[PDB]
Amino acid sequence: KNHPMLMNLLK
Amino acid sequence: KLSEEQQHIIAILLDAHHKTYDPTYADFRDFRPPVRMSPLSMLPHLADLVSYSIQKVIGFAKMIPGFRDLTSDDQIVLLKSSAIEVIMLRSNQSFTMDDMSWDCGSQDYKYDVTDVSKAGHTLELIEPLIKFQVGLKKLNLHEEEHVLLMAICIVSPDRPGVQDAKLVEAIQDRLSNTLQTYIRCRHPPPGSHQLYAKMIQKLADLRSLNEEHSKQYRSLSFQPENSMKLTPLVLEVFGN
Ligand SMILES: CCc1cc([Si](C)(C)c2ccc(OCC(O)(CC)CC)c(CC)c2)ccc1OC[C@@H](O)CCC(=O)O
């Protein structure tokens, strides 16, 4: 769940 | 004999790859510099290289038709589990069989077995890694087969933690169908069948390389002086 940088690059 | 839909898939993947791969290697001057010497002297440079590549893998995966229509959780699971495999596939573009090395425009940015050693890895990873790179290079893949293989690798329904495995499989099956048809357009049987079988085996090889890299990464990153040398993105994507 805890993946802000990955999520940001996924948008 | 590619359908319009299959051509459409290939066109999207070629576009996605060309947007996320720069063959001049210009950004390599922005990493921490290589040092060939102190243990793990190549870990800062190679961590920056891997971190940069993870960003490219994410950019490519988000263009795979259907990928962004999965849940965010499944997208995250698929990228965390496939990132290292796609990096190994993508690296094959700059691999040369003269000297078992990766050339990226300059002598500073030419990587051999020793540089990977100086990032902390042992021969139980490096030997099968070189064997994989050699076997993949000798396939002489077209760029179309290359991008399809990377996409097939990413949308693997048997990754641990995937919830909508059937939806992931639906995407992969369409990619696999497109790859098989592309091969048949270029090669009559039985060369068609033999090439596809060798591509399947390379996907199986990548899973073994994944497992071994995970073992060695967990052993390396467990030491805080080693984790200090990584990047935030590497810690997030490769972590837990
Ligand atoms: C230069 C060609 C090339 C070679 C390699 Si590598 C086979 C010499 C290598 C090095 C370190 C490493 O991991 C080190 C750790 O395990 C994790 C940090 C240490 C804890 C691994 C994984 C086993 C592989 C990788 C990427 C690459 O090119 C990327 C491409 O993206 C550039 C073009 C673009 O995208 O624009």
Short mmCIF file of C-alpha atoms and ligand atoms in Angstrom, two decimals:
data_model
loop_
_atom_site.label_atom_id
_atom_site.label_comp_id
_atom_site.label_asym_id
_atom_site.label_seq_id
_atom_site.Cartn_x
_atom_site.Cartn_y
_atom_site.Cartn_z
CA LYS A 1 0.00 0.00 0.00
CA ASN A 2 2.69 2.40 1.17
CA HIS A 3 4.22 3.46 -2.16
CA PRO A 4 3.86 7.22 -2.71
CA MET A 5 6.74 7.58 -5.18
CA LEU A 6 5.56 4.61 -7.26
CA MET A 7 1.98 5.91 -7.20
CA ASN A 8 3.14 9.39 -8.22
CA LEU A 9 4.96 8.01 -11.27
CA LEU A 10 1.85 5.98 -12.12
CA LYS A 11 -0.20 9.18 -11.58
CA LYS B 1 -1.15 -11.34 -41.09
CA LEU B 2 -1.46 -9.08 -38.04
CA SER B 3 -4.97 -7.87 -37.35
CA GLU B 4 -5.61 -4.15 -36.97
CA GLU B 5 -5.92 -4.69 -33.21
CA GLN B 6 -2.57 -6.49 -33.08
CA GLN B 7 -0.91 -3.73 -35.12
CA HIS B 8 -2.51 -1.20 -32.75
CA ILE B 9 -1.02 -3.00 -29.74
CA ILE B 10 2.44 -3.06 -31.35
CA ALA B 11 2.20 0.62 -32.33
CA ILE B 12 1.35 1.64 -28.75
CA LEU B 13 4.21 -0.40 -27.29
CA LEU B 14 6.78 0.88 -29.79
CA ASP B 15 5.69 4.44 -28.97
CA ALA B 16 5.88 3.73 -25.23
CA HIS B 17 9.36 2.22 -25.55
CA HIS B 18 10.70 5.06 -27.71
CA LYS B 19 9.41 7.55 -25.13
CA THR B 20 11.07 5.73 -22.21
CA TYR B 21 14.45 4.76 -23.72
CA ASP B 22 17.14 7.26 -24.72
CA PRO B 23 19.89 5.54 -26.75
CA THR B 24 22.37 8.41 -26.30
CA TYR B 25 22.66 7.64 -22.56
CA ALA B 26 22.76 11.38 -21.88
CA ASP B 27 21.31 11.18 -18.36
CA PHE B 28 24.10 8.85 -17.20
CA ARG B 29 26.28 11.93 -16.56
CA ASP B 30 23.72 12.88 -13.85
CA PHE B 31 24.31 9.81 -11.68
CA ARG B 32 26.83 9.53 -8.90
CA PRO B 33 30.06 8.78 -10.79
CA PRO B 34 31.37 5.24 -11.21
CA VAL B 35 34.55 4.42 -9.14
CA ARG B 36 36.47 1.24 -9.71
CA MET B 37 38.15 0.70 -6.30
CA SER B 38 36.44 0.52 -0.43
CA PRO B 39 33.77 -2.19 -0.72
CA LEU B 40 30.72 -1.53 -2.91
CA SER B 41 32.42 1.29 -4.81
CA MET B 42 30.02 0.83 -7.75
CA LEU B 43 26.83 0.64 -5.65
CA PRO B 44 26.11 4.42 -5.72
CA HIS B 45 26.42 4.63 -9.51
CA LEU B 46 24.58 1.37 -10.22
CA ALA B 47 21.84 2.19 -7.71
CA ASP B 48 21.27 5.49 -9.53
CA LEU B 49 21.21 3.59 -12.83
CA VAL B 50 18.68 1.07 -11.53
CA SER B 51 16.58 3.84 -9.95
CA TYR B 52 16.51 5.75 -13.25
CA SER B 53 15.51 2.52 -15.03
CA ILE B 54 12.64 1.82 -12.61
CA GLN B 55 11.20 5.18 -13.65
CA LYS B 56 11.43 4.09 -17.30
CA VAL B 57 9.74 0.73 -16.54
CA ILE B 58 6.86 2.55 -14.83
CA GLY B 59 6.52 4.91 -17.79
CA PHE B 60 6.41 1.98 -20.22
CA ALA B 61 3.98 -0.08 -18.13
CA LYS B 62 1.46 2.76 -17.87
CA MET B 63 1.09 2.69 -21.68
CA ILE B 64 0.36 -1.07 -21.88
CA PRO B 65 -3.29 -1.22 -23.03
CA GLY B 66 -5.43 -2.07 -20.02
CA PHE B 67 -2.69 -1.71 -17.38
CA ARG B 68 -3.99 1.59 -15.99
CA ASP B 69 -7.48 0.02 -15.87
CA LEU B 70 -6.37 -2.44 -13.17
CA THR B 71 -6.65 -1.48 -9.52
CA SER B 72 -3.78 0.63 -8.20
CA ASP B 73 -2.89 -2.23 -5.84
CA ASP B 74 -2.49 -4.72 -8.68
CA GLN B 75 -0.54 -2.15 -10.70
CA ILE B 76 1.83 -1.72 -7.75
CA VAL B 77 2.22 -5.48 -7.20
CA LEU B 78 2.93 -6.06 -10.90
CA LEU B 79 5.58 -3.33 -11.07
CA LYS B 80 7.29 -4.30 -7.80
CA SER B 81 7.59 -7.93 -8.92
CA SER B 82 8.57 -7.34 -12.57
CA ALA B 83 10.83 -4.26 -12.34
CA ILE B 84 14.07 -6.21 -11.97
CA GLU B 85 13.10 -8.58 -14.80
CA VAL B 86 12.29 -5.71 -17.18
CA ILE B 87 15.57 -3.98 -16.28
CA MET B 88 17.45 -7.16 -17.21
CA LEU B 89 15.54 -7.35 -20.50
CA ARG B 90 16.03 -3.66 -21.28
CA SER B 91 19.76 -3.86 -20.52
CA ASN B 92 20.19 -6.45 -23.29
CA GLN B 93 19.95 -3.65 -25.87
CA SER B 94 23.41 -2.34 -24.88
CA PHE B 95 24.96 -5.76 -24.15
CA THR B 96 27.77 -6.94 -26.43
CA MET B 97 29.03 -10.52 -26.71
CA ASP B 98 32.62 -9.54 -27.59
CA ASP B 99 33.52 -9.12 -23.92
CA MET B 100 30.31 -9.81 -21.93
CA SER B 101 29.72 -6.14 -21.14
CA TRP B 102 27.16 -3.32 -21.32
CA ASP B 103 28.36 -0.33 -23.39
CA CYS B 104 26.63 3.02 -22.93
CA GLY B 105 28.55 5.52 -25.03
CA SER B 106 31.75 5.96 -23.04
CA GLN B 107 34.38 3.95 -21.19
CA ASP B 108 33.18 5.28 -17.83
CA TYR B 109 29.72 3.94 -18.71
CA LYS B 110 30.78 0.48 -19.94
CA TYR B 111 29.84 -2.13 -17.36
CA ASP B 112 31.33 -5.59 -16.91
CA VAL B 113 31.04 -8.52 -14.44
CA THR B 114 33.42 -6.68 -12.10
CA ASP B 115 31.18 -3.61 -11.79
CA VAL B 116 28.23 -5.77 -10.75
CA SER B 117 30.53 -7.42 -8.21
CA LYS B 118 31.41 -3.95 -6.90
CA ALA B 119 27.69 -3.32 -6.34
CA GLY B 120 27.54 -6.27 -3.92
CA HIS B 121 26.43 -9.22 -6.05
CA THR B 122 28.12 -12.61 -6.28
CA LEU B 123 28.55 -15.12 -9.11
CA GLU B 124 25.39 -17.03 -8.17
CA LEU B 125 23.60 -14.05 -9.75
CA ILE B 126 26.24 -12.80 -12.19
CA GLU B 127 27.00 -16.11 -13.91
CA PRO B 128 23.34 -16.96 -14.80
CA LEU B 129 22.83 -13.26 -15.60
CA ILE B 130 25.55 -13.32 -18.26
CA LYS B 131 24.24 -16.66 -19.58
CA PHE B 132 20.80 -15.06 -19.89
CA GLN B 133 22.17 -11.99 -21.68
CA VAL B 134 24.08 -14.18 -24.15
CA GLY B 135 21.09 -16.42 -24.86
CA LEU B 136 18.84 -13.40 -25.35
CA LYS B 137 21.28 -11.59 -27.65
CA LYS B 138 21.63 -14.63 -29.90
CA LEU B 139 17.86 -14.61 -30.48
CA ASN B 140 18.36 -11.40 -32.53
CA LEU B 141 14.93 -10.09 -31.56
CA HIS B 142 13.17 -7.40 -33.52
CA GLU B 143 12.17 -4.35 -31.50
CA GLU B 144 8.54 -5.47 -31.85
CA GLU B 145 9.32 -8.78 -30.14
CA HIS B 146 11.40 -6.94 -27.52
CA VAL B 147 8.62 -4.58 -26.39
CA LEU B 148 6.04 -7.38 -26.41
CA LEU B 149 8.31 -9.51 -24.22
CA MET B 150 8.75 -6.69 -21.71
CA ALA B 151 5.00 -6.05 -21.65
CA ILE B 152 4.23 -9.77 -21.23
CA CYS B 153 6.71 -9.83 -18.35
CA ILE B 154 4.95 -6.95 -16.56
CA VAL B 155 1.38 -8.25 -16.80
CA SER B 156 2.08 -11.69 -15.31
CA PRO B 157 -1.04 -13.03 -13.55
CA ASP B 158 0.95 -15.41 -11.32
CA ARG B 159 2.72 -12.68 -9.34
CA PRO B 160 2.22 -12.96 -5.57
CA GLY B 161 -0.36 -10.52 -4.24
CA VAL B 162 -2.31 -10.01 -7.47
CA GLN B 163 -6.04 -9.83 -6.76
CA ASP B 164 -7.58 -9.64 -10.27
CA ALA B 165 -5.52 -12.45 -11.78
CA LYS B 166 -8.13 -13.11 -14.48
CA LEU B 167 -7.99 -9.49 -15.64
CA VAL B 168 -4.18 -9.56 -15.69
CA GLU B 169 -4.33 -12.81 -17.65
CA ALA B 170 -6.74 -11.26 -20.16
CA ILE B 171 -4.18 -8.55 -20.95
CA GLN B 172 -1.25 -10.98 -21.14
CA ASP B 173 -3.16 -13.35 -23.41
CA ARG B 174 -3.76 -10.52 -25.89
CA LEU B 175 -0.07 -9.59 -25.79
CA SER B 176 0.94 -13.25 -26.19
CA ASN B 177 -1.44 -13.70 -29.13
CA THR B 178 0.10 -10.63 -30.78
CA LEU B 179 3.64 -11.92 -30.22
CA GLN B 180 2.80 -15.36 -31.63
CA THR B 181 1.18 -13.82 -34.71
CA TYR B 182 4.13 -11.47 -35.24
CA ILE B 183 6.52 -14.43 -35.10
CA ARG B 184 4.41 -16.36 -37.64
CA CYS B 185 4.54 -13.39 -40.01
CA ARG B 186 8.34 -13.45 -39.97
CA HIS B 187 9.04 -17.19 -39.70
CA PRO B 188 7.45 -20.36 -41.11
CA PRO B 189 7.24 -23.49 -38.95
CA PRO B 190 9.07 -25.04 -37.27
CA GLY B 191 11.32 -22.00 -36.76
CA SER B 192 8.24 -20.11 -35.58
CA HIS B 193 7.63 -22.66 -32.82
CA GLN B 194 11.29 -22.92 -31.79
CA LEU B 195 11.71 -19.15 -31.43
CA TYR B 196 8.55 -18.73 -29.35
CA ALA B 197 9.62 -21.63 -27.12
CA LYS B 198 13.00 -19.97 -26.54
CA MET B 199 11.23 -16.72 -25.63
CA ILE B 200 9.05 -18.62 -23.14
CA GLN B 201 12.19 -20.13 -21.61
CA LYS B 202 13.75 -16.68 -21.26
CA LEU B 203 10.71 -15.55 -19.29
CA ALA B 204 11.22 -18.61 -17.08
CA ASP B 205 14.93 -17.78 -16.75
CA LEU B 206 14.02 -14.23 -15.65
CA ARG B 207 11.97 -15.62 -12.76
CA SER B 208 15.00 -17.52 -11.45
CA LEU B 209 17.17 -14.42 -11.81
CA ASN B 210 14.47 -12.46 -9.96
CA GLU B 211 14.55 -14.89 -7.03
CA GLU B 212 18.35 -14.82 -6.79
CA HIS B 213 18.49 -11.02 -7.05
CA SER B 214 15.83 -10.73 -4.34
CA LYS B 215 17.87 -12.99 -2.03
CA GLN B 216 21.03 -10.94 -2.55
CA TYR B 217 19.22 -7.59 -2.38
CA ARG B 218 17.64 -8.54 0.95
CA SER B 219 21.06 -9.53 2.28
CA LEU B 220 22.64 -6.31 1.02
CA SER B 221 19.92 -3.82 1.97
CA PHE B 222 19.65 -5.36 5.46
CA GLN B 223 22.91 -3.60 6.36
CA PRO B 224 22.11 0.11 6.94
CA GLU B 225 25.43 1.30 5.50
CA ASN B 226 24.39 -0.44 2.26
CA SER B 227 20.82 0.89 2.25
CA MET B 228 22.32 4.36 2.79
CA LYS B 229 23.84 4.05 -0.70
CA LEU B 230 20.57 3.28 -2.48
CA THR B 231 17.87 5.70 -3.65
CA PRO B 232 14.43 6.36 -2.12
CA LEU B 233 12.69 4.89 -5.18
CA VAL B 234 14.81 1.73 -5.04
CA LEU B 235 14.01 1.28 -1.34
CA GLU B 236 10.29 1.78 -1.97
CA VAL B 237 9.93 -0.45 -5.03
CA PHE B 238 12.27 -3.27 -3.93
CA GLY B 239 11.27 -3.12 -0.26
CA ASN B 240 9.31 -5.42 2.07
C1 LIG C 1 23.63 0.04 -18.95
C2 LIG C 1 22.76 -1.07 -19.47
C3 LIG C 1 22.18 -1.46 -18.15
C4 LIG C 1 22.86 -2.38 -17.37
C5 LIG C 1 22.35 -2.72 -16.14
SI1 LIG C 1 23.32 -4.03 -15.12
C6 LIG C 1 22.89 -5.73 -15.81
C7 LIG C 1 25.18 -3.71 -15.30
C8 LIG C 1 22.80 -3.96 -13.28
C9 LIG C 1 23.42 -3.14 -12.34
C10 LIG C 1 22.98 -3.15 -11.00
C11 LIG C 1 21.92 -3.98 -10.64
O1 LIG C 1 21.40 -4.05 -9.31
C12 LIG C 1 22.18 -3.51 -8.28
C13 LIG C 1 21.37 -3.66 -6.97
O2 LIG C 1 20.96 -4.99 -6.83
C14 LIG C 1 20.12 -2.78 -7.01
C15 LIG C 1 20.50 -1.31 -7.19
C16 LIG C 1 22.28 -3.26 -5.80
C17 LIG C 1 21.56 -3.48 -4.46
C18 LIG C 1 21.31 -4.79 -11.59
C19 LIG C 1 20.17 -5.70 -11.19
C20 LIG C 1 20.72 -7.12 -10.99
C21 LIG C 1 21.75 -4.79 -12.91
C22 LIG C 1 21.18 -2.13 -15.68
C23 LIG C 1 20.51 -1.17 -16.47
C24 LIG C 1 21.03 -0.84 -17.71
O3 LIG C 1 20.41 0.12 -18.58
C25 LIG C 1 19.16 0.60 -18.13
C26 LIG C 1 18.43 1.43 -19.21
O4 LIG C 1 17.21 1.82 -18.66
C27 LIG C 1 19.18 2.70 -19.60
C28 LIG C 1 18.54 3.33 -20.85
C29 LIG C 1 17.25 4.12 -20.53
O5 LIG C 1 16.34 3.60 -19.83
O6 LIG C 1 17.10 5.29 -20.97
#
